Structure formats: C-alpha cells, structure tokens
Amino acid sequence: ATVLDSILEGVRADVAAREASVSLSEIKAAAAAAPPPLDVMAALREPGIGVIAEVKDPAKLAQAYQDGGARIVSVVTEQRRFQGSLDDLDAVRASVSIPVLRKDFVVQPYQIHEARAHGADMLLLIVAALEQSVLVSMLDRTESLGMTALVEVHTEQEADRALKAGAKVIGVNARDLMTLDVDRDCFARIAPGLPSSVIRIAESGVRGTADLLAYAGAGADAVLVGEGLVTSGDPRAAVADLVTAGTHPSCPKP
DSSP: HHHHHHHHHHHHHHHHHHHSSOOHHHHHHHHHHHHOOOHHHHHHHHSEEEEEEEOHHHHHHHHHHHHTTTTTEEEOOOOGHHHHHHHHHHHHEEESSEEEEEEEEOOOOOHHHHHHHHHHHHHEEEEEGHHHHHHHHHHHHHTTTEEEEEEEEEEEHHHHHHHTOOOOOEEESSBBBTTTTTTHHHHHHGGGEEEEEEEEEESSSSOOOHHHHHHHHOOSSSEEEEEHHHHSSHHHHHHHHHHTTTTTSOOOOO
C-alpha cells in the first residue's frame, strides 16, 4: 500500500499539472462533446472467448490486433511522455472501430473525463489502489459517461469489495501489482465467488492457446494478453492464433 502511494503521488502530481492548462471544466466539456462511447458489455457478450489485445506505430499495432479478431484493444499510459501518450491514444482511437480500454492509475475524476475525451470506451479501476469510497465514486462517474469500468482484482477480498462497489465487469489479474509474481490460478480461485450477471475477464500470464482456454474453462468471458502480443513479430497472426484457440482444428466440411 505504501509503495503504491508513492507511485500514485506522481500520478496525482501529473494530473494536477495537466489540469493547470486544461481545466476540469474544459475536460468535462471535451468529454461531453466526444464521439459516443461503445457499449463494452455488449462487446464482451458476443459469442466466443474474447481477446483483449494490449498496446504497451501504436495505430498500426492496434489495427493488426483488430485484423486478427481482437474484441477490445487496451492502451497503457506512459507517464513519462504523457502528451505523446494522449496523441497515441487518439491515433489508436482513429485506427480501430472496436472498443478501446484505457489503462492508467485512475484515481481522480479529471482522468475519467480525460479518458472519455480521447475516445476510451472502457477504463481500468484497480481495487488495490482505491479506498472503497474512491472506487465507488470512480465507478459511478465512469458509468455516468457511458463507459464501462474494468474493475481489477488480485485477491478474493478485493473481489468482494468490487462486488460491493457495484462492479459489472471484474478482471482478475494473475500478476501482483507490486511483487510481479504471476499466479495463473488466481482467476480460477476467485471466479467462482462472482454472480452470473458479472462479466469475468482473466488478465495476464497467457503463454499460448492452452492458457487462454484454461481461463475460459474457469468462466472467463474474455482474456487480456500483453507481452506475448507486443513482443510478437506478427501481432495480427498472434491475435488470430488466440482468437481461434478453441475452434481449431475446425470441423471438416462435407
């Protein structure tokens, strides 16, 4: 909690600096005027195990992901070149028609309007980073703008908090935020304690199609993959290989 507080101090400092040039009123107006957000719940309910492909030329990479059959593209913030990060989010937004998930350390309302203004349809909320009051506030504001929150948990206790807050989509991240220990069994352990109306996403740790399928077999509606796609020589084919994980070899044609 304390080390994460130090990371969040930097995030909050940068938000405040941005707000000194683009005011809260201005970013609220930009968000209200933006092209409409896509209903990410409907996207996630489409048949088949959804692949959420992460960007972390970004537009070309996102297009390769969409071409390969990705359901959603995730774009991770780079705190060190933030205006460039926003330009890249805009470029990704113009490159694909599928929903865009913005990952950042989202802790203040300004960031929610900012994400919407730049075309995000889905926004990451990290339960380990947010006291319950803040989780509820951020979730409610995200939804009020027509976006969907990916409410990310790593423990059973965090999942319970997410449910109490009103989460509609819960992502179980196999990777610990601080220790970086990847525990693939996290999803299968936590997934049973979720109600049927909640959409379940397994994040991280996918080594190949078998791991994606294992998450799906434990109830994952979609699976988020980063490293194995960003470092692929062929992101389009790599995404297609994940999208077809359970539908190959295809049944023969008479």
